[PDB]
A paper describes a structure:
With the exception of the M. thermoresistibile target which did not contain NAD, all other mycobacterial SDR target crystal structures contained NAD, which appears to have co-purified with the protein after expression in E. coli. For each of these crystal structures, the adenosine mononucleotide portion of the cofactor binding site is enveloped by the inserted residues and only a portion of the nicotinamide ring appears open to solvent (see representative examples in Fig. 2A and B). In addition to the insertion loop which covers the adenosine portion of the cofactor, a second loop which typically contains two α-helices covers much of nicotinamide mononucleotide portion of the cofactor. In contrast, this loop is ordered in each of the mycobacterial SDR crystal structures presented here. The combination of the insertion loop which covers the adenosine portion of the cofactor and the ordering of the second loop which covers the nicotinamide mononucleotide portion of the cofactor results in a significant decrease in the solvent accessible surface area of the cofactor in the mycobacterial SDRs, relative to other NAD- and NADP-dependent dehydrogenases. Only a small portion of the nicotinamide ring appears available to solvent in each of these cases, indicating that the NAD cofactor is tightly bound and potentially non-exchangeable. The structures presented here have a cofactor solvent accessible surface area of approximately 18 Å2, whereas other NAD- or NADP-bound dehydrogenases have a cofactor solvent accessible surface area of 82–89 Å2. Given the encapsulation of the NAD cofactor by the two loops in mycobacterial SDRs, a large conformational change would be required to release the NADH cofactor after a redox reaction had occurred. Alternatively, these structural elements may not allow for exchange of bound NAD/NADH with free NAD/NADH.
Author numbering:
A (entry chain A): 3 to 214, 222 to 278
B (entry chain B): 4 to 216, 222 to 278
C (entry chain C): 3 to 213, 221 to 278
D (entry chain D): 4 to 278
The structure:
C-alpha cells in the first residue's frame, strides 16, 4: 500500500477534487485530516460545501479503513489552520502530505470587480495557500519529510476575460509554490503545483455557472478551452497527478507545475 | 512625443517612479503622482517622505509640465479613485498609468509574519489591481489607455526567503494579462516591465546591506550573481526607457507582454 | 535613436520585414548590408524574393543618404555569409548590428511532413540564424560592441496544427538567442529576439496561404490568433521594437523575447 | 500494467533508454529498441556499442518479454520506418514511443563547428521528428498512442557554451506541442520529460569531467560533484535514471489520456528557479 503509515492534510476536502484526493489517499493507505469552510460566500455566485458534505467525505475515508479527522476551517484564518494542524499532528502522528486544495472561482470584468470579491479570491486561493504551507511546514521540518501539492489552474499560466481575481491568485500560487520549494528544500520537503483544466466538480457544475440551462447547453464553451474533445475531466484525473507528486519516490521533483488540462498546455507554456 | 497626454504614476516620490515621471514630463506629458509618504513597520528600510514627493513635483515642473501630487496608499481603492477625479479635473483625462508603488521584504517560510504577507500582497498586487480599477473607467470612456504594471525578475522566477514578494510579482503578471483582456476593445493596452537589480532606495540602504552581509562594495558580489552581465545595479532610467517604449501611442498592438530589463538574468530562463 | 557610424546586417532584406528594418535603420543613420537568397524554394508554396526586390531595397536605403552593399546569399550557407560579412568589414567598417530576419513558413500535418520540407525550414529558420550569429560575432568581439536581434514568432512560444517544422525552428531560435546572449556577454554584445504575430508581408499575403479566397475572406481566421481585432499588423510595428533593442542604450537588455502580436501573448507566457 | 503494450525506445543501448526499456518490460510491455552503436566525430565522449545494445536486449528478455533490436541512426528516417515496420510485424504495433536518442556537446559561440551543430540538431531535434513521424501512422490506424520526447532542463533555460544542445532541446518542446496538436484526434498524447543532471555515460565520462575542473589534470567524480550540484536546487549532484523513468511511466500510462503537450521536469529543484 503506497501510502500506508502516512498522514495527509487536504483543505477544501468537503467535496469535488478535495474529496477525490482524500479518498484516493485513504484507499492507498494514508490517514486523513480534512477541513473545509462549510459555508457560502456572499461574493461567490455558486453554493460552497456544507457540514453534511464534509461528514460524507469523512464517511467515505473511514469506509476504506483509515482514521479521519475533520473540522470546519476557513483557510484565510491562519490561527484556525494552525490549531487544526496541531490537532492532526497529535491525533495522527505528524502530517506527511499537504494538499492546499481549498479555493473559489468568480466571474467579473475589470474595472467593475468589487473589492470584497477581489479580497475573498486572493484571500482564499493565494493567502489560504500561504497559510496552509506555513501551518504544516514546522512539523514537516521537525520530521525532515513532506510532500506539499498546491492547486493552481490552466489559468495560472494563461489568462481570459473577466477573471482578474481568479487568475491573479493562481499565478501567485505558482510563484508561492516555487518559493516554498526553496525555503523548505533542506528538510526533505517538496512543493509542487497541479494546474487542472476544466474539471467536473460543483465549482463548475451548478446553476450560477450555467447561467453565466443544461449541461449540454454549456459544453461547447468549456470545450473551447481544451485541445482534446473532452469538455470536462474527472476529478480522479487530477488526483492521480497529485499522487504521483506526493509519492516518497518524488524526492527530487520540486518547484514544478504539472498540468492536467486535456491539451490546453499544448497551446502554450 | 507625449504632448497633450496625462500620466498617473504611483510610488512617484522617488526611485523608479520619479524617473518615469520626469522622463514622461520631458517627453511632453502632464503628470499626476502619488505616494504613501510613510514607513511601514513590516518593511525594514525607510519608504518615501512627503518631502521626497514635493521634490518629484518640482522636477516635473522644471520641465515646463503641470504636476499634481497626493499622499495616497494604493491599498486604498477609494483614495486612488478620488485622486483620479482630482487629477482629471485639473489635468484632463488620464491616458497613461504606471503602477509603480511597491515594497520588498526578506523572510523565510514558515516564519513569515501574516502582517508582512498582507502588506506585500496588499501593496504590490492588490495595489496594482486598485490602480487599474481606478483608471480604467475613464480610459474606457475615452477609448484610450496605456497601462504599465511593474513586476520583477522574481515575477518569473523564485529565490530563498521571498515568498510574499515573489507571490505578489507573479500575481502582477497574471493581472496584467487579465487587464489586457477586459480592456482590449477600448483602445487600452496593459503591459509589465520586469526589472532586475535597480539602484533605488529599495536596494540601496542599510537594512538591505545589513541583511545581505556593511557598505555598497561589500554587497556587490551578492547582487552581481543575480545578473548575467557584470553590472551589480542598473540605472532607473534603463527601466524608464522600456516604460516609454510601451506607453507610446505607436505601441497600440503590444499588449499582455512582460519586458525584462535585467542585465541578462532572463537569458537563463523564460 | 541615432545610428550614425554603425553598420547593420539584415538577412532576408529583399522585401517584407527585412526591408522594413533595413530602411528604418538607414533612416536613423546606419550603413546597411542586406542579403537574400532571391530565389523560390520547391518546398515553400508561396513565391520568395526576386533580385529586383533586393535592388529596390538597395535603392530605398541609398535614397536616405546611407551606403549599402547587397549580395545573393542563402543563410544555410555559413561560408557565403562569412564572405558577405568580410565584404562588410572591407567596405563599411564592420557589422555592429545584425538582424537574423531571413525565414520561411510552411503548412503540413504530421506524419505527412516531407523531410525535405522539415530540412529546409529548420535549415533556413534555425541553422540560418545560427550561421548569421557565428558569422557576425567575431567582428563584434574584436570591437567589443554588438546588437543582435533574432526573429522568432508568436509560434516560437506557443503551438498550432500543421506547423511542426515552423514551430520547432522558432522555439529553437529562442533557445539559441539566450545561448548567444551567454557566450557573447563579456564582449559588449546583446542578443534578443522579437516574436511577431500576424504581419502583413508576402509571407502571409499570397494565393497559397489564403488557400475566390480574398483578404476579407481570411481576415476573421487570422484575427482569431490575435486578441485585438486586427488581422495583420504593419512590418513597421515590428521594426520599432527592433530599433528599441538595437539602440546603444539597450546595453543591459539581453536574452529577452519581445512580442508584437496584438495581445496573443496576453493569453499565455 | 502495460501487459499487451509494445514500446519503442530509441537510444535504448544504455543510460536512460536502457532504464526506460527495462522498467516498461518489467511492467509488462514488449520492447523494440534501437541505437546508433557507433561513436560520433563531433561528440567528445564515447557513445554506445552493439554489445551495449545486446546487453539491454538480454536484460529485457530476462523479464519474460519479447524484444527486437536494430542498429539505427535516428537521423535516418527510412531506417526508423524500416525498424518500425519490423516492430509492427513481429510485436503487433507500437503503442508507446520514447524518443530518448540524443547527444550533448560543449563549444562556445562563434567557434562552434558546423559539423557539430548539424549532428546535434540532427540527432536531438530531427531524430525526434523522425521517430514521431515513423510511429504515428500505426498509432493513428489503431487510434492509440503514448509518445514521450526527451528535452532537458536546458530545453527551458540556457547556459554558456551549449548553443547546439540548447537550441535542439528547445526545438523538442515546440515539436512536442505540435505533435500533440496534429495527433490529438487519434487517441494519441505527446509529452516531454525534462531531466536535470542524470547519472549516465553522457555525463559520467573522462571528456565531461575534463571540462569543468580543467585546472586539475585528472578530475574524479568527487572533483566535479559541486559544479553539477550548483545546477540543481537540492543537494544531489546527480539523479538516478529510474527517477526519470518513473515520470516516463506516469505519462505513457493509459490513464494519462488527457495529459498532452506538457513538459515534466525531473530536475531536483532547478525548475523552482524558473518556468
Ligand atoms: N473545477 C475546475 O474546473 C478547476 C479548474 C482549475 C483549478 N481548480 C481549483 O481546484 C480547487 C478545488 O476546486 P473544486 O473544483 O473541487 O471546487 P469545489 O467548490 O467543489 O471545492 C472547493 C472546496 O473548497 C472549499 N472552500 C472554499 N473556500 C474555502 C475557505 N476559505 N476555506 C476552506 N475551504 C474553502 C469549498 O467549501 C469547497 O468544498 C480550487 O483551488 C480551484 O480553484 C478547479
Ligand atoms: N529596485 C529594484 O531593484 C527593483 C527590482 C524589481 C522590481 N522593482 C519594483 O519597482 C517598483 C519601484 O520600486 P523602487 O525600486 O523605485 O523602490 P522605492 O522604494 O525607491 O520606490 C517605491 C515607492 O513606492 C512607494 N510606496 C510603497 N508602498 C506604497 C503604498 N502602499 N502606496 C503608495 N506608495 C507606496 C514608496 O514610498 C516609494 O516611494 C516596485 O514595484 C518594486 O517592487 C524594483
Ligand atoms: N509574416 C508574418 O506573419 C510573420 C510572423 C512571425 C514571424 N515572421 C518571421 O519574420 C521573418 C521575416 O518574414 P516576412 O514576413 O518579412 O516574410 P517574407 O517572405 O516577405 O521575407 C522573408 C525574406 O527572407 C528570404 N529568405 C527565405 N529563405 C532564405 C534563405 N535561406 N536565405 C536568405 N533569405 C531567405 C525571402 O526571399 C524573403 O525575401 C521570417 O523569419 C518569418 O519567419 C513572420
Ligand atoms: N544525462 C543527463 O544529464 C541528461 C539531462 C537531460 C537530458 N538528457 C537526455 O536524455 C537522453 C538520453 O541520454 P543519456 O543521459 O541516457 O545518455 P547516453 O549517452 O548514455 O544515451 C544516449 C544513447 O543514445 C544513442 N544515440 C546517440 N545518437 C544517436 C543517434 N543518432 N541514433 C540512435 N542513437 C543515438 C547513444 O549511442 C546512447 O546509447 C538524451 O536525449 C539526452 O539529451 C540527459
Ligand atoms: Ca505493507
Ligand atoms: Ca505638436
Ligand atoms: Ca487625456
Ligand atoms: Ca556494456
Amino acid at each position: 500500500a503506497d501510502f500506508e503509515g502516512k498522514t495527509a492534510l487536504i483543505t477544501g476536502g468537503a467535496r469535488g477534487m478535495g474529496r477525490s484526493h482524500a479518498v484516493a489517499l485513504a484507499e492507498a493507505g494514508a490517514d486523513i485530516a480534512i477541513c473545509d469552510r462549510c459555508e457560502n460566500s456572499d461574493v461567490v455566485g455558486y453554493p460552497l460545501a456544507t457540514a453534511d458534505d464534509l461528514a460524507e467525505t469523512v464517511a467515505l475515508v473511514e469506509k476504506t479503513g483509515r482514521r479521519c479527522i475533520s473540522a470546519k476551517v476557513d483557510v484565510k484564518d491562519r490561527a484556525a489552520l494552525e490549531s487544526f494542524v496541531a490537532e492532526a499532528e497529535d491525533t495522527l502522528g505528524g502530517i506527511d502530505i499537504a494538499i492546499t486544495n481549498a479555493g473559489i472561482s468568480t466571474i467579473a470584468l475589470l474595472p467593475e470587480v468589487e473589492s470584497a470579491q477581489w479580497d475573498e479570491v486572493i484571500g482564499t486561493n493565494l493567502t489560504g495557500t500561504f497559510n496552509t504551507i506555513a501551518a504544516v511546514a514546522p512539523g514537516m521540518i521537525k520530521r525532515n519529510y513532506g510532500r506539499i501539492v498546491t492547486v493552481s489552474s490552466m489559468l495560472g499560466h494563461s489568462a481570459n476575460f473577466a477573471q482578474a481575481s481568479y487568475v491573479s491568485s493562481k499565478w501567485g500560487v505558482i510563484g508561492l509554490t516555487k518559493c516554498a520549494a526553496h525555503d523548505l528544500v533542506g528538510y526533505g520537503i517538496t512543493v509542487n503545483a497541479v494546474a487542472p483544466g476544466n474539471i467536473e466538480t460543483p465549482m463548475t457544475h451548478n446553476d450560477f455557472v450555467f447561467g453565466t440551462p443544461t449541461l449540454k447547453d454549456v459544453e461547447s464553451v468549456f470545450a473551447s478551452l481544451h485541445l482534446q474533445y473532452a469538455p470536462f475531466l474527472k476529478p480522479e484525473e487530477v488526483t492521480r497527478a497529485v499522487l504521483f507528486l506526493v509519492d516518497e519516490a518524488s524526492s527530487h521533483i520540486t518547484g514544478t507545475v504539472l498540468p492536467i488540462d486535456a491539451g490546453a498546455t499544448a497551446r502554450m507554456i
